[PDB]
Amino acid sequence: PQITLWKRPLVTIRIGGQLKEALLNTGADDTVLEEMNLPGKWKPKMIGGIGGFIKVRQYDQIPIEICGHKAIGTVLVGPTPVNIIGRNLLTQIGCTLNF
Amino acid sequence: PQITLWKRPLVTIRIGGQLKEALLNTGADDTVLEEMNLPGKWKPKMIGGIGGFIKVRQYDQIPIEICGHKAIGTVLVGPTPVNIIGRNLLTQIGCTLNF
């Protein structure tokens, strides 16, 4: 696709049959989702934005389908105000900025 | 150009004859620069991100060149972790996300 930036670039993502809407975010190193109890080992982590840091759980090798594209990688879970697809997964699906 | 996302999308911008590095950030509605002096009036403003809300100074109709592409719009200045080019100016330079 080509996604313009007049509005927030929100897309539908699937994680294990739970389907949520996430922001395609070139400003984010990592991918961060709100509220979900996903499987496997997790490690505490602190991630920073405007305003300061939040504590999240880091899960590795997690499948996520983004607009029909298969992504697998590190997913952080914590009290993010919006779900965010970061560069770790944007790269996997071939996403670029173009102007 | 086309910018891939294996690394942070940091580009050189020119504002007030000053060169700075800024992050092309599709996750930001607005453009936020680290503390600097800009002319004209400004309006106090509050914005939020992953770790809450900050105070910034809002300057309107400010010219900025991003990778040579000219924009004129709103620029917020305050305690951002990094200089951030947001959707308000990304749209002006014709920037889209593509995959």
Binding site: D29, I47, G49, V82 | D29, I47, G86
Partner: peptide
Amino acid sequence: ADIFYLDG
């Protein structure tokens, strides 16, 4: 007024 920069 929402800016989701994230430094992991």
